[PDB]
Design a protein around this ligand. Structure first.
Ligand SMILES: [Zn+2]
Ligand SMILES: [Zn+2]
Ligand SMILES: [Zn+2]
Ligand SMILES: [Zn+2]
Ligand SMILES: [Zn+2]
Lengths: 346, 346
């Protein structure tokens, strides 16, 4: 079978291996139909940021059950699934509290073990999420990234009647705009460095957009005056300039949800830090996308919103291709910005 | 009348001035009995951090009503009061929401206008808080710093049954320890560089203490293992090293309340920032100490805790004296750490 294998210093190749066998009663084998590249994969590919090399990535995928272990009774060959890539231990104090992403013994498909840029993969039953039979299988690759946004909204106790601000218009951020609209946000505003993913964001329902390469924080705050109350800001870009921007533009008692991981240090001026105090902001760390009961309401909500057509996935996709095509598309990214969702279609 | 006036390059003066007159129907004049130096006053004196010079500071004080304006019907000469130093406008959208410390137009006794390091002051009726008739008048000077800690606890929805960690053993931190014990924290841990402030913390009820000049963050986290859940951490020291420490030591889903204002920039590593997300911390900006109904339940709680003898103020006090000895005590601080509460007794 074919897979995409990444090696040290940004080398990407397509490799041939034997199909993995089911080795435990609670495992399943999935034949992968659609597998997306995450923003968080780019440092793994191009900045030696993976836990090991060589490695096969991919934690955003869907497929059909190919076989099941003898202990699996609720899934059958042919069933459509999405991958639930985190595997907590379920027995540490954190896990028994429902803090699965604070488990100090978890596995992660496409990060801590090999993942979904392959024709087949064997994973635990708890690592797959059943899809509605009428849902197009390709759509299932977006479930995991949808739940990223939904988890942050969950931590903030909802976005209903809130003025939400999404910073970053990558796939995660564009999905968060669509979810915010569908979950009854009073308004949605999008902010990003380049100018018309912002047009795309307006088509998804953002009532206004700020190009941060052309507006300063004060200019943005001035426009936001009428909407300065009951704010929920999601920082999805994961660069220190946007974290700083969120604090600067925030209105009184705004909730600020951090979902983007930084790969450079954050220097905040004394003044900016002071605004966290003076505005009495609530800064909410957000990690992964899970809650009890496993894998969490986020996952059922993601599937539900898709089926009732509240979400729009096609405009997000910058590329579909099989292995050679997808590999070169990944190579073409270089250390540049993500064009849109790059999908592997085996 | 005498007052303490500080000037540009850390000069502290005792000056003579005329007694201020009541000019509006809703004003009172207070003859000041006890007036304390806040940790936040030190950058105002020695790091040119005040809004203007020359200036008279002091926002932690108590006294007796000397005279009242013609429109004041519920206070009279001889009444004991504490100062409520913030004066919001009460007519902006922030104030109408009960967000008094975000008021666009607020005044502040001892920061935006001259304060209580004087024999008499004229302030609004809204700037004084009636004390119980049996309360020793000097105790009233501690009400404002008490409510600082209580406001942070309030923002965090209480400290009851929580494992609280107080970082910084200045007067405000030591008071927050006593309040935490009184309000039923499951445990209280104190952290500071002074082994002696730490002994005091234990006598106030801290079950353990970490000296940060001698212990590492990992060393601290190791000790905190059995208490790592349901944490409430108050950062009161207001220096970048302790903000960094709070994030490093925090347990899973800990609340982190920020009450100390920085006067130096904050440089967080990408790893330290990452912990905010990975631990799913909630960072709570805390500013001043007010709520609706003005000035807030915090002030009622402070008064009550004092009257039922749940707090201990005498060991906090490092100095008592009239104008000349108080001024020299202040000068002796220079650019060093606070010895304890320095009080002016006119
Ligand atoms: Zn991802
Ligand atoms: Zn676990
Ligand atoms: Zn103060
Ligand atoms: Zn106001
Ligand atoms: Zn720096």
């Amino acid at each position: 079978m074919k897979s995409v294998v990444n090696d040290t210093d940004g080398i990407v190749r397509v490799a041939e291996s034997v199909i993995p066998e089911i080795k435990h009663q609670d495992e399943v084998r999935v034949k992968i139909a659609s597998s997306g590249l995450c923003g968080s994969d780019l440092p793994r590919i191009f900045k030696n940021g993976a836990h090991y090399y060589p490695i096969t990535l991919g934690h955003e995928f869907s497929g059909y059950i190919d076989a099941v272990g003898s202990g699996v009774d609720d899934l059958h060959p042919g069933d459509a699934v999405a991958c639930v890539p985190l595997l907590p231990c379920f027995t540490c104090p954190e896990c028994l509290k429902g803090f699965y992403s604070q488990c100090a013994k978890y596995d992660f498909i496409g990060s801590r073990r090999d993942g979904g840029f392959a024709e087949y993969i064997v994973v635990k039953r708890k690592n797959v999420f059943a899809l509605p039979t009428d849902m197009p299988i390709e759509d299932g690759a977006f479930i995991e990234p949808i739940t990223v946004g939904l988890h942050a909204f969950h931590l903030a106790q909802g976005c209903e009647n809130k003025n939400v601000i999404i910073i970053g218009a990558g796939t995660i951020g564009l999905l968060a705009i669509q979810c915010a609209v569908a979950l009854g946000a009073k308004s949605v505003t999008a902010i990003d460095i380049s100018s018309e993913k912002l047009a795309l964001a307006k088509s998804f329902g953002a009532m206004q957009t700020f190009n941060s390469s052309e507006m300063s924080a004060p200019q943005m705050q001035s426009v936001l005056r009428e909407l300065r109350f009951n704010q929920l800001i999601l920082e999805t870009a994961g660069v220190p300039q946007t974290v700083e921007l969120a604090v600067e533009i925030a209105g009184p008692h705004a909730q600020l949800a951090l979902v983007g991981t930084l790969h450079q240090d954050l220097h905040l001026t004394s003044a900016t830090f002071g605004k966290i105090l003076r505005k009495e902001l609530t800064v909410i760390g957000s990690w992964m996308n899970y809650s009890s009961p496993w894998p969490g309401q986020e996952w059922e909500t993601a599937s539900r919103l898709l089926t009732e057509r509240k979400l729009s996935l096609e405009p997000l996709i910058a590329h579909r291709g099989s292995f050679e095509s997808f590999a070169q598309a990944v190579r073409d990214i270089a250390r540049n910005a993500m064009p849109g969702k790059v999908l592997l279609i085996p």
